């Protein structure tokens, strides 16, 4: 089962889907295969009902679409309509929560309120929104509004990118005509210029995937900043992951999905219904993450993560998963047809993302702890079914450290230097002690073995000094593996890095060093590492392609990892895929993206599937950005 | 070739680029045989990184996607995605009116004006917006607010389907939850949970689609409320059509595309510039239309119709096209390659969409004349190039009277009842002389014969009285074989419709009927047949679902199409598909569009390969509407 996934907890779940004849995401992989190469290599188009058309990689004919679509301008468009899908599942996100903060102050949803006052603040502030004389309120209803009024045009553009990057990079991207008008516009935009008889010019159509991969960015930072503002911004906190955070005498409780909007009352409505739990025969409600809306709650509360992404079913697997409570995306609908054999009760509670088999349970923001309590008495009553039963839990788990929004960064560097926070950062990168940033982000995918390049890459970078950072599912790759916990500093780090976070932990009291990798967050916490980044690249007065900074989206599935990739070289990184994107067909898209980009943004993707090579590949990314500012390296 | 168009024209242009060796849209589709069932059948998923997945429609291994999205969510997330698109151009197009209104009367945009002032009231009293006191300027700045906030959420729905469609008509759609919040805010809607890991429960999928084509609904009436207000409401005009419009003596511009905004500048700058051409040993500037730009300028200006849809490469090759300017949409991209071999110069004018290899000229509105100037220079200066070489226009042209806008259509049977116009329509649906109504829409479609579907289906419509009109590319293959010349109403229309279209025609004064087909204009004026029908069912107290009307997409093509079909089924009316759109392998997916919808929105698919058997398909469909209404049939 180690072909399948590297986490020891999957592998025995895998064991027992085996033994029972639960058909798992590997076993459906496995039956699709030989995966068409057409569709791998990006060599399809149905865009229009004259197709499908393809083109041949290599040889006769097809050469060309039936409209004369060329490879290039199919491989571009396709693309771009991932990049376009990506934007609006985080784009989506972000305006459920811009909703909710609305209707929080507007008296509406009594449930949610503002947490975090300060950032409330700084948002407005960076907004250009007055907060002085104002009643909190008020500014975060000007907030929201800014937030909804950045999905369609207006006499600015979107403000969560123009605000939120530094003028020198604002200005390359402006020069490009890259910044987007409005974040749904640019959706629409794309999936128009991509249909059939429109954009047919490879360049052109990338540019405006590279513009709509900014409306994503802009959507992640929305994200980020409003589940800030109504949960709190996180701070540095412990916890566990993997299976064995699950309670056989427990209701055990998946949040699923993305949005904190959902996940975070269950998580306090849970607290409230414990004697309800405990009149049931249950110790109380074991509320348990699973992808990002998991790492909305551990960041948050601590709540400990079951699982992640490719691996997703095998929660269910153990027995003991009374619940499992969605929003949307990134959730395998095959989780409704398992939940008839695990007995699991799969909910789903938003109209828009639904699974036929799932009970649904509508949850309005206006009725949230009702809506919640409801959903956790069906997971109370599920529990009192499996009364007897046995189950099987992996007794394995991580330690994880978590926590690190860029603010509790700051802060923690603080401790070193407080006026000026990040200089001890630039120091270390100066003096080699820190080589430079790589962030982990994105999905596990069912085609490579789960996990291994996460930690593959991670492990070499960490002993050449690199400080990584790691947010959605390559937080959980790595969480589940050991990278969250400071009793691993030692073996995994370099002198240089383990001197680094050893002087930040000690000064922040811990005794100890900071974890090998910092959590920051989810995927749409992608953003915070932006926010580092352009803080960085604010600080020492160049723009973010000058910086030793990196991403590795080193296991990616999801049109919203590809737009984030697609962000990450937007605003100037190296970054890194590894696997493929359906592109190799193209072999002018692909010089586009992993070389002449670097003419217009300055990042650049590198496509490499084998991870070793991989983190050679981003150290020398790293490396060159080393030289380039006249360091060592 | 024959069995590529119906068009003799298209035949024998197809022969000139036969012993040229030009390839064509038929031959790349040759290419492209036997095309891939997975997607033919909508059993192919591409949407993450872990696919592509495929279904085998039938038979063993694949039968479900590798995150568990069985045939049925794959089938319907991938009809969803291409009504988002449809929908995302048809809205581009009216955005960009849109923009263009609120330019030209902010003085931005001298080119443009509000022509159409009557139009301009009636929009606004519609939307609500106060005209009494009010300068155009003002009015039409606040019409122009509105359609571009009927792209976004806001505090009302998106108001180009609440205030087009009759209250019960909208009560049915609300109740069901199908109004669209804004444009953009459903395609992006779509994208998101069309992705991965989001709905999966194919009722609810297609719900949602059923919405965003209510979207794509809106796109179409704004643009043509917009493209009205600018450039006129059409009146009945009479011109020509097919290749033979092309003059070998005069320099041929083709507008190709859709957008009234760049095609109606050519055209009047075009008569300024007359004895420039003069000047070049032209002629003039003889501009012709293809696709739904020149049936803009048809309708408008009597521009004569060169050629739509699958042919259009063979106005090219021809050797007399000087000119194509395109803006958006439907462009097959081989033209910028043909042109190397034709001559032609291919010019583009958008900057979403570019094709490899032709020159751009950016056309801006604040610019339009000057703008069109320069692509008309280009224009003559290719005329003195072919100085002396022999050109292939083949002799073959149709007379069209078109220009049946609803509102002309209305005058039009004025003439018989001033002050209950669709009385005499109805009094002929209840005796009998008029069966019902069907709408032609659509492209052609390369696996179809060229305007096979079209003209048989409507050969036996109009034989068992049916008033037939007619839009798009439908509308360009029934001018095209000669059902816009009242000259063939004898032949073509049976007695009871031949009696109404005299008696219509005559009280005219016409001396003759009005012409066998209305064409009521281009694809986004699929609304203006919207407008007619709403007006016939407020003026008959009935909902949509119970009038004796239908549409037929009889070879369709673009997502555009997909979009309308979807549209036209959701207000109400059995709508024919006469190529397959990728629905076959869920049976499900079937059920649901062809038959449960009826449930839903009254209206229904009809999938219909074989055009006798779709005639007679949409002649039970209407015969059944004269039923439930108690008519005879
Ligand atoms: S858009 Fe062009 S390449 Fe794509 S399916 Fe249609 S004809 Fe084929
Ligand atoms: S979304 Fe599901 S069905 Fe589609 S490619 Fe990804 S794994 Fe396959
Ligand atoms: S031919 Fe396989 S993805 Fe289209
Ligand atoms: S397998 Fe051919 S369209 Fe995907």
Redesign the interface.
């Known amino acids: 089962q180690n072909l399948k996934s590297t986490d020891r907890a999957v592998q025995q779940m895998l064991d027992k889907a085996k033994r029972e004849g639960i058909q798992t995401?590997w076993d459906?992989?496995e039956?699709?295969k030989p995966?068409?190469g057409?569709?791998?290599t990006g060599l399809?188009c149905?865009?229009?009902?004259?197709?499908?058309?393809?083109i041949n990689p290599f040889g006769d004919?097809?050469?060309?679409?039936?409209?004369?679509?060329?490879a290039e301008?199919i491989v571009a468009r396709?693309l771009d309509?991932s990049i376009?899908?990506?934007?609006?599942?985080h784009?989506?996100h972000a305006?459920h929560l811009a909703h909710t903060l609305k209707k929080a102050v507007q008296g509406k949803a009594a449930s949610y309120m503002i947490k975090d006052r300060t950032k409330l603040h700084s948002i407005a502030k960076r907004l250009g929104i007055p907060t002085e004389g104002q009643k909190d309120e008020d500014i975060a209803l000007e907030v929201a509004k800014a937030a909804?009024a950045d999905?369609?045009?207006k006499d600015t553009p979107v403000l969560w990118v123009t605000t939120v990057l530094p003028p020198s990079r604002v200005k390359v991207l402006s020069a490009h005509?890259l910044i987007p008008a409005?974040?749904?516009?640019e959706?629409?935009?794309?999936?128009?210029?991509?249909?059939?008889?429109?954009?047919?010019?490879?360049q052109?159509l990338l540019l405006?995937g590279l513009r709509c991969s900014l409306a994503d960015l802009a959507g992640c930072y929305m994200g980020t900043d409003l589940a800030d503002i109504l949960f709190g911004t996180p701070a540095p906190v412990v916890t566990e992951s993997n299976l064995g955070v699950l309670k056989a005498d427990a209701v055990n409780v998946a949040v699923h999905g993305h949005n904190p909007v959902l996940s975070d009352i269950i998580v306090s409505v849970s607290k409230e219904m414990e004697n309800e739990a405990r009149a049931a025969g249950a110790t109380g409600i074991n509320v348990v993450g699973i992808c990002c809306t998991g790492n909305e709650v551990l960041m948050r509360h601590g709540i400990p993560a079951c699982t992640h992404s490719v691996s997703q079913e095998m929660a269910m697997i153990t027995g003991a998963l009374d619940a499992m409570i969605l929003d949307?995306?990134?959730?395998?609908?095959?989780?409704?047809?398992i939940a008839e054999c695990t007995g699991t009760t799969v909910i789903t509670t938003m109209?828009?993302?639904?699974?036929?088999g799932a009970t649904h349970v509508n949850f309005a923001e206006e009725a949230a702890v009702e809506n919640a309590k409801q959903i956790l008495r069906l997971a109370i009553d599920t529990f009192k079914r499996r009364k007897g039963k046995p189950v099987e839990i992996p007794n394995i788990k991580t330690k994880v450290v978590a926590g690190f929004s860029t603010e509790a960064i700051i802060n923690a560097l603080s401790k070193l230097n407080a006026n000026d926070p990040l200089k001890p950062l630039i120091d270390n990168v100066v003096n080699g002690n820190i080589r430079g940033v790589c962030l982990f982000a994105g999905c596990n995918?069912?085609?490579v073995p789960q996990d291994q390049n996460f930690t593959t890459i991670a492990r070499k970078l960490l002993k050449q000094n690199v400080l990584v950072v790691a947010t959605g599912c390559g937080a959980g790759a790595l969480m589940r593996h050991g990278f969250m916990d400071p009793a691993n500093v030692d073996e995994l780090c370099g002198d240089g890095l383990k001197a680094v976070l050893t002087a930040i932990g000690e000064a922040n009291g811990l005794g100890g060093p900071l974890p090998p990798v910092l959590h920051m967050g989810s995927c749409v916490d992608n953003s915070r590492a932006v926010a580092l980044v352009a803080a960085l690249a604010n600080r020492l007065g160049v723009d973010l392609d000058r910086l030793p900074v990196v991403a590795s989206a080193a296991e990616?599935?999801?049109?919203?990892?590809?737009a984030i990739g697609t962000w990450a070289v937007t605003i100037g990184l190296p970054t890194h895929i590894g696997?493929?994107?359906?592109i190799t067909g193209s072999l002018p898209v692909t010089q586009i993206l992993t070389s002449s980009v670097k003419d217009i943004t300055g990042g650049y993707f590198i496509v490499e599937l084998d991870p070793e090579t991989a983190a050679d590949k981003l150290l020398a990314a790293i490396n060159e950005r080393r030289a380039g500012l006249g360091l060592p390296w």
Do not use: W
Request: charged share 20%; aromatic share 4%.
């Open positions: 995401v459906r992989y039956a699709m995966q068409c057409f569709g791998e399809c149905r865009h229009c009902l004259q197709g499908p058309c393809r004919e097809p050469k060309v679409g039936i409209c004369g679509a060329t301008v396709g309509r376009a899908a990506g934007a609006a599942g784009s989506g305006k909804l999905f369609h045009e005509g409005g974040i749904d516009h959706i629409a935009e794309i999936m128009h210029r991509t249909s059939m008889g429109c954009d047919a010019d490879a052109n405006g949307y995306q990134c959730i395998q609908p095959s989780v409704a047809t109209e828009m993302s639904k699974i036929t995918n069912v085609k990616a599935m999801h049109e919203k990892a590809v696997v493929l994107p359906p």
